[PDB]
């Protein structure tokens, strides 16, 4: 379970490095 | 408490995947 | 410890809604 | 294992500040 926890945080700023680099913004663009 | 903590994380999975498919971009495009 | 983490957590909740509801886009418009 | 969960809340900290204050905007506007 603390592992889960470790990974859940790397995925949750793996999403937001790709937010970074947005659905809506890429169709309007 | 870490259950709790699990949850959060959901919660925050959740919100990023709302984010990345915006409440004034939306607005600016009609959507 | 495991309180500054769950309330890091609820901060990093709180920080994701208020992007939700941007600096450059709130300048832009 | 405890610090490195503490460590990577401060990188999300730190990368919602960016984020706050976006690559495809920034280079919309020129900025």
Chains 1, 3 share one sequence.
Not at 1 to 20: A, T, V
Request: hydrophobic share 40%.
């Amino acid at each position: 379970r603390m592992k889960q926890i470790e990974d859940k945080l790397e995925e949750i700023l793996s999403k937001l490095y790709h937010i970074e680099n947005x659905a809506r913004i890429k169709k309007l663009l």
